[PDB]
Design a protein around this ligand. Structure first.
Ligand SMILES: Nc1ncnc2c1ncn2[C@@H]1O[C@H](COP(=O)(O)OP(=O)(O)O)[C@@H](O)[C@H]1O
Ligand SMILES: Nc1ncnc2c1ncn2[C@@H]1O[C@H](COP(=O)(O)OP(=O)(O)O)[C@@H](O)[C@H]1O
Lengths: 721, 20
């Protein structure tokens, strides 16, 4: 009894551990009860139980600080017991660790220890190492003396002493600033998938020998540079405890013929001697490029050598080889054969949430001013990867150091601790860093869960429900689809006038479903068509298969037909290279992958009709121009970004804009805003948009869909019945 | 018991502030 599996925690606090309620009932404890955790090598820690709705019943969630003191790792099991006997301490002696007290001097108690305990009522245990962050530095402290033993709660009325030289770290404990899983921001799902593959073979090697199951031996990671491929490989080795050996293409290739092969073999021999071990091969496409693409004897031979060593992993017990490449199709296909590198994880580019998480991670030690808004930065940093956001945070910190602390600094190797602790980084310093940074991955497609919700779309209430029936019902009610022999649709095409919200509809359903949204825009379909590179369609669909659950949206499906002349063009048909590859991939995609494909076109009369056949976008939804009540809803939604006076009659405007699309109502909202801004500026050479600004905007705004086009759109929808 | 409920109150406050 009372044995729980060690897992990760969300709350980074050095004293909180979370349990699922069924285990809180078996231990006869409640929220806030003090418990003791017993680990390995006669070590224990004292913590406060909280509860949540995310911990598994058999697991206990704790942060790195607790795991390090218990000398346990993720996947291990610890013993937990209540200890309601604890009362507040009297005197404690806490000293810093030398490893972190570098480049700094001053009253470390007032800077770090006093905040960390002040009205915090923290449990501590003799010998515990805890981390206090601040002043752009993460400083850890050891408890060396306590009047009560072995543990107590540090209360505001206790005496905290701190005198003596910094303590040298012991060999039985690891530095709390070493790369771990809590240093990785976006791509949390990918990290979870890797943990499932590596945590058990390495932490419990006896299990895979005793049970007839084969472990993964090779994991291929890929994505743009600066996304965390190397960061993961290092974090995994540090978290599991496996010996880490680094290999990189350029270094192996820099060696002479015969030396490159010998050195590559030695790396595998060292991993075996120190097993369990993880080998990380960076730039896999450089060390082992496609043989049929290289004329050099050395580049062709090194591929054979790596393939042999990878196969030898059946004899080299407990060795896992991870590799990183920029593109999964730039490596010799032999490496991807069963065995060797048979498992792959697409890291890709951090999404809007991940970018915020990365900014939060690289600011852990930074004191941010009240005006700092990292979510706003994450939304502006489009095309940035972890390497760029890390540089952004470092530049923001550096400018704050120049503005303030550089006036205060010594002609000496060490800063006053109080100076750094009082150094706050303002929004202006983050904005400056943003202007200096340049995204390293702006062209590659970014796949993420969209932030568009149903409340952002005016009108079309019935269409919103239709998408739910096409996307949610097949998996929310699978017993009804099986009972009635229903075949779920693989996708839907939206057709009708432009500017009615087709794009938002596809995003909104992806958002509610918590599914990744893949945005393929007209220019991307045109790029493949113009350059005769339709092969890239397979990579797009591969993203949908690996990103599942996801919604794969192909916008402006008629962009090629229009780029071919649209109304006239040549004498050919609607089929072309890009759409043909799309049709092929759709036929090879099963609904069991939880991928739903949505198309949109504003010229359905020139779309390849094959896309509407069973097995493709067989469902058709007509999206008309919004009606009067919908146009008002659109105007109200678009004006949520600006002050608007109460005199503005949005219903009157909607009555006039009878032939306007939603995109045209946006122009009216923006045009009236522009007038309000211009008048406000001129008044100093006003506080809100006035009725006169909307009535003036109506004098220039026009409908983008003519009466001739409205009838064409309606007659087409009528023909389809 | 009510003495350690003060550490609970501090922990719960730390957590719910960090939700901001
Ligand atoms: N997903 C990520 N989350 C957090 N930090 C990241 C992420 N990706 C990259 N970084 C940061 O960017 C840098 C990556 O450098 P490195 O580890 O050499 O990787 P690589 O050179 O393969 O991109 C590190 O400072 C790391 O902390
Ligand atoms: N029903 C609607 N509700 C809210 N906004 C809309 C609506 N229809 C169009 N819009 C606005 O018009 C813009 C263009 O919409 P979009 O679906 O991209 O049109 P198209 O696909 O024809 O170019 C969107 O950015 C959106 O803000």
């Amino acid at each position: 009894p009372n044995r729980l599996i060690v897992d990760e925690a969300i709350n980074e606090d050095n004293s909180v551990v979370s349990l699922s309620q069924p285990k809180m009932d078996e231990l006869q404890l409640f929220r806030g009860d003090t418990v003791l955790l017993k680990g390995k090598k006669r070590r224990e820690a004292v913590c406060i139980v909280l509860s949540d709705d995310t911990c598994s019943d058999e697991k206990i969630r704790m942060n790195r600080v607790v795991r390090n003191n218990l000398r346990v790792r993720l996947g291990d099991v610890i013993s937990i017991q209540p200890c309601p006997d604890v009362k507040y301490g009297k005197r404690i002696h806490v000293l810093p660790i030398d490893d972190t007290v570098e480049g700094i001097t001053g009253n470390l108690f007032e800077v770090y220890l006093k905040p960390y305990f002040l009205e915090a009522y923290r449990p501590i245990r003799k010998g515990d190492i805890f981390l206090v962050r601040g002043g752009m530095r993460a400083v850890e402290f050891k408890v060396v003396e306590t009047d009560p033993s072995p543990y107590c709660i540090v209360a505001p009325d206790t005496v905290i002493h701190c005198e003596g030289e910094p303590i040298k770290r012991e060999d039985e404990e690891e530095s709390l600033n070493e790369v771990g899983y809590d240093d990785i921001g976006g791509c949390r799902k990918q990290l979870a998938q890797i943990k499932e593959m590596v945590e058990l073979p390495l932490r419990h090697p006896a299990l895979f020998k005793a049970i007839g199951v084969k472990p993964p031996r090779g994991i291929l990671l890929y994505g743009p540079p600066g996304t965390g491929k190397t960061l993961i490989a290092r974090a995994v080795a540090n978290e599991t405890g496996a010996f880490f050996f680094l290999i990189n293409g350029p270094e192996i290739m820099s060696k002479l013929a015969g030396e490159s092969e010998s050195n590559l073999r030695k790396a595998f021999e060292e991993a075996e001697k120190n097993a369990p071990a993880i080998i990380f091969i960076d730039e896999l496409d450089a060390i082992a490029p496609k043989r049929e693409k290289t004329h050099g004897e050395v580049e062709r031979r090194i591929v054979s050598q790596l393939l042999t060593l990878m196969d030898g992993l059946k004899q080299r017990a407990h060795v896992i080889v991870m590799a990183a490449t920029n593109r999964p199709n730039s490596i010799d296909p032999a490496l991807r054969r069963f065995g060797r590198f048979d498992r792959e994880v697409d890291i890709g580019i951090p999404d809007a949430t991940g970018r915020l998480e990365i900014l939060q991670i690289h600011t852990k030690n930074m004191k941010l001013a009240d005006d700092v808004d990292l979510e706003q930065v994450a939304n502006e940093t489009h095309g940035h990867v972890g390497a760029d956001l890390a540089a952004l945070c470092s530049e923001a910190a550096l400018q704050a150091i120049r503005k303030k602390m550089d006036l205060i600094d010594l002609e000496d190797e060490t800063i006053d601790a109080e100076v750094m602790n009082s150094l706050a980084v303002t929004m202006d310093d983050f904005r400056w860093a943003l202007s200096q940074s340049n995204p390293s991955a702006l062209r590659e497609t970014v796949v993420e869960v969209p932030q568009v919700t149903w409340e952002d779309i005016g009108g079309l209430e019935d269409v919103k429900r239709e998408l739910q029936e096409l996307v949610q019902y097949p998996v929310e009610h699978p017993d009804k689809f099986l009972k009635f022999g229903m075949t779920p649709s693989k996708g839907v095409l939206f057709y009708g006038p432009p500017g009615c919200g087709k794009t938002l509809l596809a995003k909104a359903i992806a958002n509610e479903c918590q599914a990744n949204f893949i945005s393929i825009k007209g220019p991307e379909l045109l790029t493949m068509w113009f350059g005769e590179s339709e092969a890239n369609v397979r990579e797009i669909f591969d993203k949908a298969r690996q990103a599942a659950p996801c919604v794969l949206f192909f916008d402006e499906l008629d962009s090629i037909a229009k780029a071919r002349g649209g109304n006239i063009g040549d004498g050919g048909g609607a089929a072309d290279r890009v759409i043909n590859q799309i049709l092929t991939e759709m036929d090879g995609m099963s609904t069991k992958k939880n991928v739903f494909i949505i198309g949109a076109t504003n010229r359905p009369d020139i779309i390849d009709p094959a896309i509407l056949r069973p097995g493709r976008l067989d469902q058709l939804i007509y999206i008309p121009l919004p009606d009067e009540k919908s146009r008002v809803a659109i105007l109200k939604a678009n004006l949520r970004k600006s002050p608007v006076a109460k005199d503005v009659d949005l219903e009157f405007l909607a009555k006039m804009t009878n032939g306007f699309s939603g995109a045209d109502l946006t122009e009216i909202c923006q045009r009236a805003c522009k007038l309000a801004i211009r008048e406000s500026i001129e008044s100093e050479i006003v506080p809100e948009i006035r009725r006169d600004h909307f009535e003036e905007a109506m004098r220039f705004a026009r409908r983008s869909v003519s009466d001739n086009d409205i009838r064409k759109y309606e007659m087409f929808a009528q023909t389809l019945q | 018991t009510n003495e350690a409920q003060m550490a609970a109150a501090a922990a719960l406050a730390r957590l719910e502030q960090k939700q901001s």
